[PDB]
Enzyme design. Sequence first.
Site, short mmCIF file in Angstrom:
data_model
loop_
_atom_site.label_atom_id
_atom_site.label_comp_id
_atom_site.label_asym_id
_atom_site.label_seq_id
_atom_site.Cartn_x
_atom_site.Cartn_y
_atom_site.Cartn_z
N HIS A 103 143.82 -41.39 66.92
CA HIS A 103 143.88 -40.12 66.23
C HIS A 103 144.86 -39.16 66.91
O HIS A 103 145.69 -38.54 66.25
CB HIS A 103 142.47 -39.53 66.16
CG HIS A 103 142.44 -38.07 65.86
ND1 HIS A 103 142.96 -37.54 64.70
CD2 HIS A 103 141.95 -37.03 66.57
CE1 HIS A 103 142.79 -36.23 64.71
NE2 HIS A 103 142.18 -35.90 65.83
N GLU B 54 154.73 -30.08 76.80
CA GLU B 54 154.64 -30.71 75.46
C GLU B 54 154.00 -29.75 74.45
O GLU B 54 154.52 -29.64 73.33
CB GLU B 54 153.86 -32.02 75.54
CG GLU B 54 153.56 -32.64 74.19
CD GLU B 54 154.77 -33.22 73.47
OE1 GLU B 54 155.88 -33.13 74.03
OE2 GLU B 54 154.59 -33.76 72.36
C1 HEA Z 1 148.43 -32.53 66.07
C2 HEA Z 1 147.24 -32.32 66.64
C3 HEA Z 1 145.91 -32.49 66.02
C4 HEA Z 1 145.50 -32.27 64.76
C5 HEA Z 1 146.28 -31.79 63.58
C6 HEA Z 1 144.09 -32.59 64.73
C7 HEA Z 1 143.30 -32.51 63.64
C8 HEA Z 1 141.95 -32.72 63.62
N1 HEA Z 1 141.21 -33.12 64.73
FE1 HEA Z 1 141.78 -33.58 66.56
N2 HEA Z 1 142.42 -33.91 68.34
C9 HEA Z 1 143.68 -33.79 68.85
C10 HEA Z 1 144.73 -33.31 68.08
C11 HEA Z 1 144.74 -32.94 66.75
N3 HEA Z 1 143.64 -33.00 65.98
C12 HEA Z 1 143.74 -34.20 70.28
C13 HEA Z 1 144.91 -34.22 71.28
C14 HEA Z 1 142.47 -34.58 70.57
C15 HEA Z 1 141.89 -35.08 71.90
C16 HEA Z 1 141.96 -36.53 72.15
C17 HEA Z 1 141.13 -36.91 73.31
O1 HEA Z 1 139.99 -36.42 73.39
O2 HEA Z 1 141.50 -37.91 73.95
C18 HEA Z 1 141.68 -34.40 69.40
C19 HEA Z 1 140.33 -34.68 69.36
C20 HEA Z 1 139.48 -34.46 68.33
C21 HEA Z 1 138.05 -34.69 68.36
C22 HEA Z 1 137.28 -35.17 69.61
C23 HEA Z 1 136.62 -36.55 69.53
C24 HEA Z 1 136.03 -36.97 70.86
O3 HEA Z 1 136.13 -36.20 71.82
O4 HEA Z 1 135.87 -38.18 71.05
C25 HEA Z 1 137.57 -34.36 67.12
C26 HEA Z 1 136.26 -34.45 66.76
O5 HEA Z 1 135.90 -34.13 65.67
C27 HEA Z 1 138.74 -33.96 66.34
C28 HEA Z 1 138.79 -33.55 65.01
C29 HEA Z 1 139.92 -33.19 64.27
C30 HEA Z 1 139.82 -32.82 62.89
C31 HEA Z 1 138.55 -32.78 62.11
C32 HEA Z 1 141.07 -32.51 62.43
C33 HEA Z 1 141.26 -32.08 60.98
O6 HEA Z 1 140.66 -30.79 60.82
C34 HEA Z 1 142.64 -31.81 60.42
C35 HEA Z 1 142.64 -30.63 59.48
C36 HEA Z 1 143.91 -30.52 58.68
C37 HEA Z 1 144.58 -31.55 58.17
C38 HEA Z 1 143.87 -32.44 57.19
C39 HEA Z 1 145.92 -31.97 58.64
C40 HEA Z 1 147.13 -31.66 57.75
C41 HEA Z 1 147.65 -32.89 57.07
C42 HEA Z 1 148.90 -33.37 57.15
C43 HEA Z 1 149.37 -34.80 56.88
C44 HEA Z 1 149.98 -32.38 57.25
C45 HEA Z 1 151.09 -32.55 56.25
C46 HEA Z 1 152.00 -31.33 56.16
C47 HEA Z 1 153.25 -31.30 55.65
C48 HEA Z 1 154.16 -32.46 55.80
C49 HEA Z 1 153.91 -30.05 55.15
N4 HEA Z 1 139.91 -34.01 67.09
#
Ligand code: HEA
Lengths: 51, 102, 236, 75, 59, 269, 45, 534
Positions: free
Chosen positions: H62, H243
């Site tokens: 992810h 970054e």
């Molecule tokens: C770019 C960075 C980014 C983005 C966008 C997201 C989006 C989301 N992230 Fe995540 N997340 C991280 C970066 C990101 N995350 C990182 C670094 C970690 C930590 C990893 C680690 O623990 O090792 C993490 C960890 C993380 C966890 C922790 C899991 C655990 O600890 O094991 C969770 C849990 O729910 C979560 C949820 C979400 C959710 C629900 C969204 C959703 O809400 C997204 C909501 C919106 C969208 C749906 C996206 C838009 C869609 C597109 C395709 C854009 C297109 C646009 C155009 C081209 C104009 N993220």
Amino acid sequence: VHFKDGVYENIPFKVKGRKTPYALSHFGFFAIGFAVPFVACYVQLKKSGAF
Amino acid sequence: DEETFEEFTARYEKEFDEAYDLFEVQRVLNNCFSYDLVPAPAVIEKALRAARRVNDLPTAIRVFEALKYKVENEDQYKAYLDELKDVRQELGVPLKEELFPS
Amino acid sequence: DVPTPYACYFQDSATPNQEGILELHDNIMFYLLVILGLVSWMLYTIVMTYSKNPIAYKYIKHGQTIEVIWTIFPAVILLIIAFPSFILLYLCDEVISPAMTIKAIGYQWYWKYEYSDFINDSGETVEFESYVIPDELLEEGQLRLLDTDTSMVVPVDTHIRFVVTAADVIHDFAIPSLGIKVDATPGRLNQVSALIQREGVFYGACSELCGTGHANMPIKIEAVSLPKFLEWLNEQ
Amino acid sequence: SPLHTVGFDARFPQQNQTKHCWQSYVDYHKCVNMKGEDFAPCKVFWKTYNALCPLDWIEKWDDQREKGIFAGDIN
Amino acid sequence: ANKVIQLQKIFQSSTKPLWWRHPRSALYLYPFYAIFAVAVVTPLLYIPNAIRGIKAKKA
Amino acid sequence: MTHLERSRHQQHPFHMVMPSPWPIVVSFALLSLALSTALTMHGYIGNMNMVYLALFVLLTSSILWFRDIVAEATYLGDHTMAVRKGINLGFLMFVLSEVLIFAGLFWAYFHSAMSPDVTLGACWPPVGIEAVQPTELPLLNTIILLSSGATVTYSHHALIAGNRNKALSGLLITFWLIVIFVTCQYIEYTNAAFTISDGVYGSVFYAGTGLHFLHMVMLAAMLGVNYWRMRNYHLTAGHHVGYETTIIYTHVLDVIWLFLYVVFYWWGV
Amino acid sequence: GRIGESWVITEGRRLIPEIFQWSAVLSVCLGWPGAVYFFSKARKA
Amino acid sequence: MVQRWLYSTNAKDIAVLYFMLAIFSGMAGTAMSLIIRLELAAPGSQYLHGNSQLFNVLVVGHAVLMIFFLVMPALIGGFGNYLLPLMIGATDTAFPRINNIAFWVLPMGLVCLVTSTLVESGAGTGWTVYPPLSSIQAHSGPSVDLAIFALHLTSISSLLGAINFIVTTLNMRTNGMTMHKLPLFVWSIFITAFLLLLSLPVLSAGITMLLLDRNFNTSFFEVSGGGDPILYEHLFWFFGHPEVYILIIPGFGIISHVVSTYSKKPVFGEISMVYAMASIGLLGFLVWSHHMYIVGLDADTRAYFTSATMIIAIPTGIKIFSWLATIHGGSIRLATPMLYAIAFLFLFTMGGLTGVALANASLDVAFHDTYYVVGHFHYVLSMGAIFSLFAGYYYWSPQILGLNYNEKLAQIQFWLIFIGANVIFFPMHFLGINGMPRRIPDYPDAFAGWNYVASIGSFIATLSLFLFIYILYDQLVNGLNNKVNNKSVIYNKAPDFVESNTIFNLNTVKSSSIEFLLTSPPAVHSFNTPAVQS
Ligand code: HEA
Ligand code: HEA
Ligand SMILES: CCCCCCCCCCCCCCCC(=O)OC[C@H](COP(=O)(O)OCCN)OC(=O)CCCCCCCCCCCCCCC
Ligand SMILES: CCCCCCCCCCCCCCCC(=O)OC[C@H](COP(=O)(O)OCCN)OC(=O)CCCCCCCCCCCCCCC
Ligand SMILES: CCCCCCCCCCCCCCCC(=O)OC[C@H](COP(=O)(O)OCCN)OC(=O)CCCCCCCCCCCCCCC
Ligand SMILES: CCCCCCCCCCCCCCCC(=O)OC[C@H](COP(=O)(O)OCCN)OC(=O)CCCCCCCCCCCCCCC
Ligand SMILES: CCCCCCCCCCCCCCCC(=O)OC[C@H](COP(=O)(O)OCCN)OC(=O)CCCCCCCCCCCCCCC
Ligand SMILES: CCCCCCCCCCCCCCCC(=O)OC[C@H](COP(=O)(O)OCCN)OC(=O)CCCCCCCCCCCCCCC
Ligand code: CUA
Ligand SMILES: [Ca+2]
Ligand SMILES: [Cu+2]
Ligand SMILES: [Mg+2]
């Protein structure tokens, strides 16, 4: 190199004048993207003996 | 930019006399209403006499419409309509409320 | 001591270190609420009035007074909260005159405790391992993913030094209500101090991704009285 | 209270305490190598390296000394 | 010897792609393309075993 | 030249490169290299024959890319003053990035040595490790490198001045001096008493000086390319950009080796 | 002098309605989780 | 057709390939975050049958997809390659063949990361890949190797592209344009290109040394040979923080253009905006160990990093007040790009204020591996950088494509993601302050409450993404009709008050950058006689 100009000329895919509907290309392309996490789950749950 | 109010009127009075077509009268008018002040009555009179010289009635109507947006009270709008009384009457310019009465 | 459903605040404090951590959180949030009140208000009252402005003020492009003032104002606020934040940093790092030391070692999905002050009547090292009770073996009323088959027993009102390390990969010794969090790295020994002001049971968990069993390695600590601790120590 | 343990040492005032264990183990074994195994204040080192040092670490260093592989300079 | 000017007029009056204009370019491009195909296909023919956990019996 | 004739030539000086197959052929060789190395390091492929082929195809595919830059500058006239200035600036930003790769290897060396770990003996070097002495074969190397930054200076200035024989001899000597440095490190390696397996000392030592070894093999390949081009009349007295990039390279590698020799050999021993 | 009513009355008439509209928006953005807990089993039994 | 898209040397065609790959990757990374949020809905095994390794694998996949395969190829590979040469008058980029290899390594890096999750058991390590958990004893087989090679291929991509961006800006500006006259978006890609050039080589040292421990019997980080795991964290985090700024600054330059266009005012204090962007890019190299506050560093080391981290709030707050000063006294036009920009100013401020609390080392004891941290960086990355990516697409795609989009459908899309993103991430702070660790598939029963609320919002936001996929379809099939009916906005600037309807038709565009003066789909030979400014 000389290329063409216009509206549907600066993209690599064909939208008009095609036999098959463009909806099959547009949503098929984004369906395969959304579907690769589920293929991974299937292989790994079939390795743990869950299936 | 340190320009006093007195220098503001004397510069836009000169700028309304040199405008030679509709594009020039509308462009000069746009910049005159874009500061943090209401132009003096002697500036409004020269803007009406510049739209007469290019023969355009809607530009003269819009002059008083911008005036009622820029003032702070409705008693500041009235005191302008009481200074520019002859000129609005001599050139035959109506008010936008008088033209489209509600 | 224990998390509660729909809670939105710190667990209750049992040590002066967690008392001070909470005091610094609340002091900072006083000023973060002034800043959010300003920014959200200016944003709201600009959209509501200039979405209906027909003539833009295109000749306003700079200001010397406001630009100097809004460069200095965030520096004063930042300096106000750095004063108590530096004091708390050096008050928690000191470990002066402790009365007992306990070692905790992290393993692939269990903990291990050692007492080596040789205070017990026979002068050995007291040591045992601590495991999470599995779901299939739970007795009704016990807490899932929290209760362990053995716990660490400490006395109250005593200064304690904790020594933390690891055997295989990185783990983390953490108990929210005591103000403790420290990585457990194979190769080095870190230390922390505590002084518990009331009796009870305090729960924690491992806080350094350690593989499949990262969620099944909890920490449970009991604080009892001094005559009660010597009896427990002299038996186990 | 009947509770006692080693206190603050100005050579090792930081959170990192790795060298406190290792130096007390090293001092102790070289104290008995010349002043004899039994020495009233040679027990000061023995208490400190026992109090704050893992039992698996001592187990490894003891086995290395048996084969002449202890990296500490004790002789 | 010097052959800059002579090659300068061969290159500037040629219709072929840039990597094809030199008279000696057939001897490099034909064997490279065959070698390039083997070096891409063969690693791909091994992912099925890697997913299935079969290891080569070099023993 | 009137308005009619000026119309037949470009209005800007910049270079419009025609489509080429090389950028996407290099990418495929990079994936074939990545997939092969991981599969052979773990036993799914029996031998090292497939890794050898992927390195050979990454190599001959960059040659052809370099072959098309020679033709665009010697036979086509596409490198005007502005194109020449941009090429020089791109190369300086390349070496700055490569210099910071060594900067990360010097961090790892100093982290391991200023407060050495107790499993080593709390001493640097660790007990039982016999290190390389400075006033030795490594002192012949630091002189052989300093001696090539002055024979390359007089070759460059003999080409600006129009002397051909003097230019061709001061480059044939810089070649065999970098070649001598390379085989001298080979002898120093097969005779050392420790290995990269010998703990953290043999890891930081052979990483810092082993990366520098690989650049020198690349540096000797560049001086051989210049030798063919200078002897066959590609380089002119005012237009030689493939040469200045090589010259800047021999001077940065000289400074990096100087740092390696002071830290890894004089201070750390 | 000045023509019309005081600038305090003119500005007061424009901001007072906006203070209440601001506090009713920021309360929704920050207080909406309070409503979820209101209809929960854990709350007040 | 084959040689236009496989042999390309044109910077506009290459930028279209970038965006195609970037959006195909956000599909996969959103699908993984949906599987993650379904398994966190309630206590117990839910959908993965108790396979905790698989849950950890999907978390690495992810993060890698969202960062290295969506946000970087779109904000930089896409908008940078398309709008930077057009905004300065350049006929191409410098080095057009370098520009093409920096795209074709990303497809090969995807068929390395995907095959990493299918081999043996995958890499269940976290996106930081700490040893010894990621060494051959605790992670055997080829999965962690194939993930490192994937990261190597994205570093070649970003480094080669950065060298190209730097030379083009310094060498190929048009007549009269000096470095003080650059548009603010050009400044944001130029400064970002320098952070990549000085931080990527330190990451390539760290992860190549990790590959050597696993396969070549080396002790950089192994504790039995004298190595130290804490060295890896210094080397990894010295690239990490730079970054996060490599991910927000290009969005800072997008926000500047959108806010100025829909206010009809120039950016307030434009020169102090460049000075602030440079100060944030410099102070982002002196703060990295706020990510190591509890690993046992000295107390005087921790007091330095506290004050260094706090003072990056001063230049960032200058950019926040500057943006509010340009919209004050404006003539605001509430089209779709303007909605995202106003939400950015409110949701980025919140995410940045929870970072100020984290900056103090004393308070970070109660904020380590806590969901509270996860709440901080999804407010600045998903209501931050992501919201600026939507603002960009709605701002430039009608010009780039020649096709308009359904306006009222786009305002429904904006409200569905604004509502749904807040529902996922706001309760994350409540879980963290009460003490819930991160990177767990299962939790004690007292955390069930807020975890159910966040899993609902995850369905709201995925529905908003599926509406965006339909809006793309409608723009590509009905884009020419969207111009003649009243279903889309034609002019992003309307006539001035006293400007009549027919005078407005003499100059339809009032722009301070070149890009809105070209043909709608810009010509493949955009400049022959160079553009000239005073
Ligand atoms: C770019 C960075 C980014 C983005 C966008 C997201 C989006 C989301 N992230 Fe995540 N997340 C991280 C970066 C990101 N995350 C990182 C670094 C970690 C930590 C990893 C680690 O623990 O090792 C993490 C960890 C993380 C966890 C922790 C899991 C655990 O600890 O094991 C969770 C849990 O729910 C979560 C949820 C979400 C959710 C629900 C969204 C959703 O809400 C997204 C909501 C919106 C969208 C749906 C996206 C838009 C869609 C597109 C395709 C854009 C297109 C646009 C155009 C081209 C104009 N993220
Ligand atoms: C876009 C990405 C992004 C951005 C912009 C930021 C911005 C900031 N971050 Fe963040 N951060 C991450 C992405 C980002 N971060 C990620 C991904 C992690 C977790 C990594 C992982 O573990 O996987 C992380 C984790 C992280 C940590 C490590 C905590 C931990 O792991 O335990 C810290 C430590 O201090 C930190 C602080 C800050 C600060 C002070 C800013 C500052 O720049 C914010 C400044 C902005 C403002 C302050 C708002 C506006 C200011 C004003 C209006 C001025 C007036 C204000 C005052 C007077 C106070 N964040
Ligand atoms: C499967 C159909 C086969 C039909 C069989 C042929 C019979 C005749 C039918 C005629 C159809 C011919 C099929 C050819 C293939 C085809 O035209 O569409 C098929 C193409 C695939 O091919 P591809 O070239 O894009 O490469 C990619 C192959 N991996 O789908 C698509 O990309 C759909 C992609 C649409 C989504 C992109 C949206 C982005 C919009 C651009 C915005 C850019 C903004 C930039 C800002 C910086
Ligand atoms: C963007 C990130 C913002 C950071 C916010 C993190 C949290 C900070 C601490 C906030 C304390 C909340 C009070 C607890 C009330 C309680 O007592 O809760 C009571 C109940 C359940 O309580 P109970 O039954 O379990 O027990 C105790 C029974 N009395 O819950 C609720 O009503 C949920 C209501 C949510 C509260 C609104 C939060 C508003 C704070 C805005 C912060 C703005 C950010 C500033 C700039 C960054
Ligand atoms: C992507 C950016 C790159 C970042 C690179 C950061 C780290 C690079 C440092 C290591 C570089 C290679 C060291 C030289 C080999 C060496 O180590 O010397 C050789 C050592 C010394 O011989 P011996 O041990 O037998 O002792 C001698 C006693 N008689 O033997 C070995 O090692 C054997 C193992 C082979 C090592 C090859 C490792 C290749 C992987 C890295 C490839 C190079 C990186 C990319 C460079 C373009
Ligand atoms: C295992 C596979 C590894 C492959 C790597 C091989 C590397 C060996 C080095 C060979 C370089 C040959 C270049 C000659 C081309 C030429 O002709 O340059 C000469 C041209 C022509 O200008 P002129 O002055 O001659 O004009 C003639 C009179 N009008 O100017 C330039 O282009 C200058 C740019 C040269 C830069 C070359 C690239 C250097 C960096 C590449 C690094 C790649 C590996 C990096 C690994 C970390
Ligand atoms: C800025 C963005 C703001 C957007 C506003 C949010 C609205 C979007 C939808 C939110 C999803 C709701 C999650 C419910 C999960 C659930 O199942 O709730 C369960 C709880 C009972 O608990 P249980 O233990 O019995 O659960 C048993 C599990 N099986 O039933 C409810 O409480 C019903 C929901 C209450 C409705 C409130 C919705 C919020 C509106 C706010 C209005 C303004 C309030 C102002 C207060 C000052
Ligand atoms: C895993 C082992 C590590 C392998 C390293 C990755 C290999 C990928 C590249 C393979 C080499 C093919 C030659 C392409 C380069 C080229 O040709 O540079 C030549 C380009 C050609 O310019 P032009 O044709 O675009 O313009 C047309 C004008 N005639 O001159 C320049 O740009 C000038 C600046 C030179 C900078 C070159 C940088 C070297 C590239 C390697 C960088 C790798 C960084 C990461 C280090 C680990
Ligand atoms: Cu031990 Cu996670
Ligand atoms: Ca679950
Ligand atoms: Cu950070
Ligand atoms: Mg951690």
